[PDB]
Design a protein around this ligand. Structure first.
Ligand code: XYL
Ligand code: XYL
Ligand code: XYL
Ligand code: XYL
Ligand code: MG
Ligand code: MG
Ligand code: MG
Ligand code: MG
Lengths: 392, 392, 392, 392
């Protein structure tokens, strides 16, 4: 299986370009040139590329310099036919951001954080980006008495309301996707799970403009079911973007290739996104890989790992489709009553008065008998895994 | 320290009444008589008691029995002065609920679960309860393909909307509090965190009647910061009730005495609830203990553990108070700029255009100079712990 | 595929016999008759059955009854051809063991626990069992000041020394396998990991008679790499038995079918046990499934789940072999230098003197040139996974 | 309280010298001069300093440069009276060590790793160090097939045996302490817990020269009980050194000040170390702080944090002492039967024959009556916390 532009695989400049300088060691790879990255990604089948401001234009470049880089970049885009679906802002590397960007205790950093983002918004607008991803990696704390959470939420809100105002006035048409993470680099980060981020967004001035950008690994760092949180995000209609990668439970952020961590959950996730409502996908945005080529790899390893991401997705897609088309699976789904959940509990026009009048829903209900029948969930699970292993 | 009714300490009948039958062994204690529980709790300083329908009236009791039990319980409350601030329904023990109550794949189970709850709502209203707690312990799955999360959320919503309709029509004036839990007993439970529960509630028909009942150990089972989560719940004004207990990170649900698990977090929590805006608590409801006397204890051990919860809460309060009152802390708070987060980032009437025109927010900003000043956070943190330790 | 007796699939009576009473609900299945269990397991392909004393003969059975049960049990084995490779003792269910068996604070409990095991050793010897599995599920504490760990290790040693003495004197020829578990049911269990259990065994009187019985889920409950721990156990030659099941990281003990938790680690484990040196398996004992059919299931789901354990192991075995036989994998192993780790670091006869004299190992070593070369681990991992997906 | 040289508090040069460059951002602090670090530490009460070769002498310094640094270093030590109790080698920073030191798949890296270590042993021996700590941070894997564990353990052992040999031949009198860590920077690290390292040490040629250097957060990263694993290390007599710090369960390595993570476990750890058998401490080596001043701090916060480690230890020690001298705590200990575990289970001269003969141990044992007695553990835990809280 080969990738098509229709597959919408995108990669951040910072994924393949990660020099593998970790918390305990020096970089093992030299810098990757952006024009080069565009060319290489175009070649493996990516339809788009994304970047933080500081990944493209080095922090503090004079305008001449900055202007020069963008022009080169745009040309590479042009030539390869690659788009920029999303852009983001680095509000975490520079020391000024050590206590946060939008929620730093220091009022002056907060002000600067907003200016840095407005600037990136203009560039995204210029390149045709549709989504602004906001990853508040430095928002949070190491000690509970150091951060007033309430005030922090007020200030996070204050900042986002302004960005939407500006986008709307200017006619940029951007959608804003908040990216949740429980920890790292901060002991605890504000808006730690998909849920916390969706609940927060519901409180902004133009909520219709806000959604989330959940990352496989970030939910798994708390041992949460990623597929299940994406299902809820889809239910709320707030899945604006997705970051795919791999992780092995709660430990530092690994950023493995998609599917290299929890494989079973990678399978159920592809099934969810692709075997949507009609026959059609339940999700129509970019399939963005936010991973890191392992520190043990050279540039051959980097390109191999980029390809591996696409390969894992396409292989899982193929088995998800086969799973749903199998008659034996249909039968197992029927025995487990999966579809019965979609039928309303109440009959049309039934309220509490009618339910209370139904002796069979309670007074004459044989709970003991119903409780003895099996759901056949193990058998259904076993057919799924056999599809995954190509055993059927 | 002594507990007063103004402290609002409540205990579930199922807490002190837990017979200590765990997943690997038989009960080590005999059954506690509801009436006796009422007298003992009154005695240790509790202001109220809570119960699941099946904790007071054995599942399947005739109305004659059922009625008799309610009558006696009512007398005991009478004589002791205890109130019933909250009631809940057992939608997890009986085999019929093996796949959930409200979200069972079986339609008949769903109808049945609603009836069970309406009935408990009646008793609650009769005893003066103000909050109905809903713990969906069996709503979820062990396998991804077994549960359509979207359909599940629709059915959860359908059931809750009917419940609010009924209470409002009967004039019960109840508040509904959804209690989030990540897992146990299902592999994964729907609405796994305080964040997911809040996001869901915002989608109901009468959202103002719904909030959450977060539990200390539930959030800690995912290694989340309970205090930070409550802070967010408070920002949303959805903290309708709270279950206090202890846990040692991600492992089975321990249900230790409040403060016997993450002690540092227990401290920041009491500080949050009690040192609210303008002296006054930030939270006004019951301080409810949903814990279990360890399996190694006898009734002596049981009463001891009941008192330990009150004791822990009162000792923490006392230190939280002293912490805030200390001029040295006051000074460290100032140096760390904790209160500066309360000042809007933007000046009065300032928008994007005035901010874009302010050179000091970007063009002329010295990020390197600001990036080098320390926040003094370790020192503030050490002052808090010395207060906790009674060394200051 | 199909299981043969040479596969050595064994199951505990308590596995398929689990009635599904969990920490939060009643049993959903009726009791399983042991003779029937023997028959059903024989039919699905098991070569042996195991059990706790109390699984077979009800706690507090008179001599007559006990004798009666054993004789019927022996006939079923007879008739079917199943053997009893291992036996174990229940030291966790009865209330008397709430603080442990062998390390109970109470001396009379320790004496009783020893007696209870001697008696099972006799029945085990009589049924032809080769291994005595010892799971100290109640050995540990909820509170640090409640248990003197050093004294508990002394008492643990003291009880095992005696069991070895007895078995050697009676000529039973048993091997003893300690099973480590980090928590559940105690807050913290003694000998929490495979490592702690091997270190302990080394301090016994006749260490050659002791090894471990690691369980997949137990190590995963602590987020450790099961395959890697089993590779260490085999290095030490302490892999006396193994319990196979599934788990989804740090949370309550799930006991899923083998391969239904961490699929990637189940694959690497099967590869390690089967693609041993000299073509042959690195492990020759029983492949024992210590799992539980989900509570949502009836007796059909029970046999279905029993068969799934076998099918999972065999499908994985098949892919592990294809993996190792693939020329492209062979090429990736070479580029990764996996086998170069097997060649000694020092040339034959070289010691520190000769190493010190080698300028090429330090003074003239180009660490920078070496550090630039990649290991091709990502490609190697991608090939393993494609073999697992049946995509190659 | 004030620290005395008798307290034996030591710090790594790399703790107070951490420039705070994390996985997501640049350093926030300038480098600390080693001579200045020696003077500052002496001033806060440390008795010793430790260092990795590369902390003191920049990787690749010519011999003139290295010699000068060493001489200024020794003068500072001289002048302040601080000693060097342990030394260590950096086998994790340079790109060459990306696949490990002693266990890299690449043979030449393994030879270079041993020479780097031998060179540090000479410098340690000349500074008077008695312990060589070995932290194999890069020994491990991100993928299961990339590393042969058995070969890795063989290579590990091969390097360690040579080091013992050289030391013994040179009369250096060093003791070796392996430091276990579960993950970070490798996905999975070899010898993941104190248990795994102890079991490995037992297989070396001269086991008596080898022990472990366990770190508080390292075991907490796996959610294990640190005090309980230290208790077991003490039972084996392998606690050669200890690294003290704070962590909040399973997440990246936080390296907080000691006591700022799991306060209750810090308390029980100090109790174990100081309130050893015979009035005296159970452990007499250095109390080493391997922590990092938070990225939010400047040099004032760095010294505040160094002082916080010592304060934390002394406050907990004071409370542990008061705890044990409390006649009420003693009475609770007697009621909980803690000391009764210290009494052999078997009577002097009793063997299995006599045990089998004691009907009080079984035939006439009333399991049921014993099973109903409470142990009073909750009450005991409550008194312990009241002491920590300074409430008693
Ligand atoms: O944890 C790292 C984060 O995922 C970032 O890569 C964001 O997605 C973009 O700032
Ligand atoms: O995890 C168990 C839950 O906390 C329950 O006790 C609820 O609060 C009431 O059903
Ligand atoms: O966690 C429970 C244990 O796995 C038991 O099944 C043992 O293996 C036998 O006592
Ligand atoms: O996790 C980092 C390690 O703990 C090191 O500080 C070692 O103690 C010495 O190399
Ligand atoms: Mg991301
Ligand atoms: Mg609760
Ligand atoms: Mg087992
Ligand atoms: Mg260390």
């Amino acid at each position: 299986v080969q990738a098509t532009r229709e597959d919408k695989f995108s990669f951040g400049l910072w994924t393949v370009g990660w020099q593998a300088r970790d918390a305990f060691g020096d970089a093992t790879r030299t810098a990757l040139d952006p024009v080069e990255a565009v060319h290489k990604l175009a070649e493996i089948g990516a339809y788009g590329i994304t970047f933080h401001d500081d990944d493209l234009v080095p922090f503090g470049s004079d305008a001449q310099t900055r202007d020069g880089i963008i022009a080169g970049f745009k040309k590479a885009l042009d030539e390869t036919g690659l788009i920029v679906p999303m852009v983001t802002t680095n509000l975490f590397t520079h020391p000024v951001f050590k206590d946060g960007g939008f929620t730093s205790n220091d009022r002056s950093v907060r002000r600067y954080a907003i200016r840095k983002v407005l600037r990136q918004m203009d560039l995204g607008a210029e390149l045709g980006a549709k989504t602004l991803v906001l990853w508040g990696g430095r928002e949070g704390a190491e000690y509970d008495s150091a951060k007033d959470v309430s005030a922090a939420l007020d200030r996070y809100r204050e900042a986002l309301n302004l960005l939407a105002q500006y986008s709307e006035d200017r006619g940029y048409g951007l959608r804003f996707a908040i990216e949740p993470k429980p920890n790292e680099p901060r002991g605890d980060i504000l808006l730690p799970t998909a849920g916390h981020a969706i609940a927060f967004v519901q409180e902004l001035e133009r909520p219709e403009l806000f959604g989330i950008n959940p990352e496989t690994g970030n939910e798994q760092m708390s041992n949460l079911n990623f597929t299940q949180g994406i299902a809820q995000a889809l239910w709320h209609k707030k899945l604006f973007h997705i970051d795919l990668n791999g992780q092995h439970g709660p430990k530092f952020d690994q950023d493995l290739v998609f599917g290299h961590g929890d494989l079973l959950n990678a399978f159920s996730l592809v099934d969810l996104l692709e075997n949507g409502p009609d026959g059609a996908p339940a999700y129509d945005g970019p399939r963005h890989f936010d991973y890191k080529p392992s520190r043990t790899e050279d540039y051959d390893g980097v390109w191999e790992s980029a390809k591996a991401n696409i390969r894992m997705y396409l292989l899982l897609k193929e088995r998800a489709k086969a799973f749903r088309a199998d008659p034996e699976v249909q039968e197992a789904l029927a025995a487990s009553k999966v579809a019965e959940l979609k039928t309303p509990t109440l009959n049309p026009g039934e309220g509490y008065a009618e339910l209370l009048a139904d002796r069979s829903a309670f007074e004459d209900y044989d709970a003991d008998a119903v409780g003895a029948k099996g759901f056949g969930f193990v058998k259904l699970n076993q057919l799924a895994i056999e599809h995954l292993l190509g055993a059927r």
